[model samples]
Target: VFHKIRNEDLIFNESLGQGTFTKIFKGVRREVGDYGQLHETEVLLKVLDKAHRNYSESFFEAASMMSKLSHKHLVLNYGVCFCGDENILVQEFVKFGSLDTYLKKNKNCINILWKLEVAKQLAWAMHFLEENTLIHGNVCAKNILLIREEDRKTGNPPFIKLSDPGISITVLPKDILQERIPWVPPECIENPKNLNLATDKWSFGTTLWEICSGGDKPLSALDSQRKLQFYEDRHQLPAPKAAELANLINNCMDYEPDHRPSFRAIIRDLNSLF
Candidate 1:
């Protein structure tokens, strides 16, 4: 069930990241009850861009998706709130930030064993979404988060959690930005609104490559949209080193969307590798 709190109740700490329509703040939720003293917990509060024209639409879409999904590998949504035109989503605070950022900083630390484990966890999360008939439109290094604890210090064998699932593919402009280009399938680029399970699989393949490459850039083979499209059109992909992983890369990044493996198949393959 969802909880409610006033905007003033959130004590902001630090800015995690900002998008066109939202800015995420690392903060604590202050909850005081009639029964006792005030309670506070570390949380991430995603405040919507009140200045955006489509503010309400984006906020509600995000809220709808976050409120419905519940999985261990998925970010936990504490609740949503509206302060006039300003909207906010209170979510569980992840110790480590985006997995992509982590990989960039600690790529040397991630070995083959860790790569398999990451793939295994990602497959589990993707399979969960598939079973529910839901699609995580954006599945990339930026959306994957880590929270781990080796000692009391925490965060050694990083566990991943998926974030930012509710937004529609069409809402975000494509082709204009190179950062979002690599994770996007060719068809989605051809038709920005063509996002579905198949496109999600394509993105999963990109994510797998990210894991195997120890957090490399999106599609390393191509720098521009035209090049990426041309590369995919010719069935060229950034190759994976492992045998089974190579199969996954090939299947998930299939030229024809229908040829992609189901999430169940992916999970099985990942488990086999591990």
Candidate 2:
């Protein structure tokens, strides 16, 4: 059973961030309660837009599914509050923020090892999602969160956590997706609602490019969206800095969805690389 958080107990502090259908706020809780208990714990309050066309049903279903997933590479979804048609989702507050911004600022500081570890963690999460009968409609640098390491004795590369999996992206307007359509599968672009494992594989390939280049570093050969679409239509894709890495990405972005390797295979290749 989901708990209902009193509107008054939520003390909004600073803005965490914003999305197409939600605004995230750093929140403090004045009262201690068990339902979504974090009363004294700091949290990111995702205040969803009640007016979004598919909020109610989609959020309910997605929340239920998300709560059941437990993985080291995936961000934790605490709980949600429902009052009338409005809703709020509480999540663990990751202080390090998003990978896209982090890499943009510290590009020169990171090396191939760092990028490989990031890809491995993401592949692990996506593999779990695939086993659970879920499709992460979106997988990009913006959705990947990072945290500072406190020093681990394991000797393995530090890993980041993935957020915004499953159907979360379905709530966003089509125009928002258009801005990053280069990451989207061609079939999905043909129809926004047409998403599946194949499309997820395509986005995963683009995400690999983003990680390799530190951000969305011109995957397609053109400057404009229309021209990029044209290039894609001709079986063109963004080139990777490394030949082996480019081969993996090209396989993932294969025009025939069936040609893409499974997340399991991706993990195997990633493990071999690192």
Candidate 3:
């Protein structure tokens, strides 16, 4: 990663946030003509070490993934920067952060247990992907960004987006994440040799646990050695909440990935459950 940014790049904006390997900047386009002319823009200029193997692959992956991903529940993009080693990806800048920030800032004010509407919306988005995808990843609260509206409580559409799409590739397999373990199924850590659709199911179950328990990333919460121990021996704390929902969360964490329900079944079940 170069400390000196060239390419006549505008001054780096300090107010923009930082990711693990990226420095996001607020930016706009300066065009020669009047097409979308003089448009104000908020762009994330991702600056990563182009020296890494995943760098180019990640750049292409981000473009390919965002280009093909067409969902209202997903974030939309504007453009990208692929010039030289700078490895920039210009994207829709979000003024607010994600679900993790929400809980941290407002611990007591939220009526999480009574958040049936919120659950319903989330379930609807999940059902869309579950019924539609065989992709091997499940969403976490960190991945789920809430877009606030005029009425924050009502929660508007096109605001709730699932971000960090495949950015986990940047995270090492053993790397401990911020808030995912509480929602991670045990098998992913327990039987790393095993990988398949069932693991994704368990991840989904853990995500549901987040909704009920209010955005807990259970597995990531454990110490590194404890994380390994919990997976190897299958240790679990009683889930924060007790409902048939907890059973589903547990079932998804099945030691054998194949034992979990298919995403299709999840969609059908949630359609009825929520």
Candidate 4:
């Protein structure tokens, strides 16, 4: 039931960013109505490599799955465009950009409560995914987008959007581990086949760490070898300043996958903190 936008209707603006197999462009989509009325909306066009094997099947699968998902904290998937040499996944343009960059840039301006709210909203999004039986597979600060700026006067929480819910599994480079090694759990690192809902929890904890630490890289002090050792030994990262947040992160990054708290439980605890 997703709308199909013709390539001719898309006006490319500028390059937003690029991943291994995809390039994001800030663009505007033109639509024509029954009365010949024209409408334009700013959007992000994620163009995937058409050269990959099974690219068409994977793109269709991801597009269909994303179309079925709707949540306030989940990025809106506008539609898809399969014209010319590109297979484009159209989505709403989140103006504020990724959470990692936001957190790092505005470190001094953000308050603790606001950060906690961000974590809570993230939990809400992940809880929705869990209820839908979809594993995000990749959960990190970089994958989370800030949709709206924080309102300091009213203490209203900023709008957080979780992007690429299960898209990683559908369209990702073969060497995904090389890119996501830091956020991944030991189980998944040891055996890539072990990725599951619990693995998302582990990455969520890392994302929490990123938010609390002002967007600092997880395990930045350690070399790659030691980082692997730390994960293998089930060592916990340094705690955040807030006691409750530190406790939550610890529970989320628990060594045993089964022992990690469900997103529902995480939401409840985060609510209690407020």
Candidate 5:
């Protein structure tokens, strides 16, 4: 069950980021214990303008979906606050931020094993979503967040969490189409409305490309014409040094949707690597 947080209980901090109709903030949530003790937890607040287009529908849809999902690799949504001028989505604060940013910042320190582990965690999350009959819609580096381990002395890789699964319904299609061109599958590019489980597999492959390439933008050098040609020819980004990983990515990115491996198959292959 989700908590109905009071607006006053939240203490907003610095702005984390902003989207079309929502603003993210690093905040703190205060709760009163049953014995009158005070408790505080760091939280990430996604505040949406109450007057924005489809506010109620978008907010409730995301809230309900997140509330029902319980996975170690999925971001934790604490609750929501709808009493004020804006609706707020309270969630656990991830210190390391998006996977793309984390990769770019620690490129030299990251190793192949670390990358493989990250990929495996993502596949595990996708597997859970698939079992629940849900399509993530958007599966890319930016949508994946990292949580820093408390035991810094162990020098462990940060934990990964898949965020905003299937929440693209909140954003305008035109905005998503342009920004996510590289991660999108050829079928979806040809027909903007075409999206399904297969699309997630393709995007997952592209995300793996990003991880393997040390956070490099996918197909950055290719122009629109060359991109179409590349896709039509069923070509992929330059393969990583790990042949097994390269082969798996190729399988995930097959031009034919039916040829792409399901998340279950992807998880099995990933497990064998370790």
Candidate 6:
């Protein structure tokens, strides 16, 4: 533990944030030898306890995979701990908080101008991921974090960073049958036995629809059991704040997987949505 820590380590702050597999703590360490211009830092420490099987190895893989990804919309993973019992991951905390929080709290912020800006950013991020053969796998309000780029204190060229990945999929156990339908593609919901990139594209479309329409989820106000009724009865989304944008999402959540727009096409339409 001594080797991994610096002199300025602080305790975990529950208020900062926490995820399914890790408890993120806010830390700051300012010392002469610390690398680059990061002497003053605000990072989240992901603590994966010993109780969870594969937690260690999975973290290793997450670190290795995320290390190679560099994008304005992708959250940055700066460092990780591999030693026994110190299995923590560290990265910057997008302080403006998740888009879910941003939208829900600012219900009236869905003016056409704001929505178009959101569409452009979301589409651009999806485009970059598709270019690399990577799907966000989970695209939802909660997983989308907004950074106050305009806040001079945070740094310039500001933008949102898509946060929390694989674990969103982990919720769908291989042993289980039905996947999370609202955020999941219709194909995966029907088959439940298989998944693919096309599914991710559909989910992204659904997510974009949510952002543009303010904060309406596809199965708005329903719990899992009621939301599942989509299989027997088609689930409905809220009336789009704007007719054109609403129509865009209607095509996105179509039942037939083949009827859905490709990620590339979705990006094109969303760019126009902006």
Q: Rate the local accuracy (lDDT) of all candidates.
A: 0.73, 0.71, 0.54, 0.78, 0.77, 0.62
Q: Give the C-alpha miss distance for residue 60 in model 3, angstroms.
A: 3.7
What does candidate 5's lDDT look like per residue over 33-150, in tens digits? 6798898989988887777747545555755685598889988888889856777888888888888878778764676777878898899898888788776767888778888632
lDDT of 2 by residue, 1-274 (tens): 4456667666778886776567778987565656856557677787766677475557656756756777787787766766456688777778777887887887536677777888888888889888887876767888888865324476667558887553354565555566656676776656766777777788888888777776645544444467446535756465765444677788888777788899999999988975
For model 6, residues 102-198, the per-residue Cα lDDT tens digits are 8878874546655556666776777776777764567776677788634446534336777646443534453222335567765565555435556
Model 2 / residue 262 / CA error / Å: 0.5
Q: Order the numbered candidates by lDDT, best leading.
A: 4, 5, 1, 2, 6, 3
In model 1, the Cα lDDT at residue 170 comes to: 68
Better of 1 and 6 by lDDT: 1
* Regions of candidate 1 where Cα sits further than 4 Å from its true position: 32-37, 53-56, 149-157, 176-179, 220-224, 227-232, 240-244
Error of 1 at 40 (Å): 1.7
lDDT of 1 by residue, 38-116 (tens): 8888988887756664654754575566558777898888777776677787888888878777877874475676777
Candidate order (TM-score):
4, 1, 2, 5, 6, 3
> Which of the predicted structures, 3 or 4, would earn the higher lDDT when compared with the native?
4
Backbone-clash count (model 1) = 3
Could you tell me how far off, in angstroms, the CA of residue 133 lies in candidate 5 after the best superposition?
0.8
**Cα deviation of 114 in candidate 1 (Å)?**
1.4
Clashes of 2: 1
Compared with the true structure, what per-residue lDDT tens digits does model 3 show for residues 172-245? 35454312453445644443444444555666666666666655556545677766666667665467553646
Better of 4 and 5 by TM-score: 4
- Clashing residue pairs in all predictions, respectively, total 3, 1, 8, 0, 0, 0
* Cα RMSD of predicted structure 1: 3.3
lDDT of 5: 0.77
| Candidate 6 backbone collisions, by pair | none
TM-score of 1: 0.85
Q: What TM-score does candidate 5 reach?
A: 0.84
User: What lDDT score goes with residue 92 in model 3?
Assistant: 57
Clashing pairs in 1: 148-155, 149-154, 149-155
| Winner of 3 and 5 under TM-score | 5
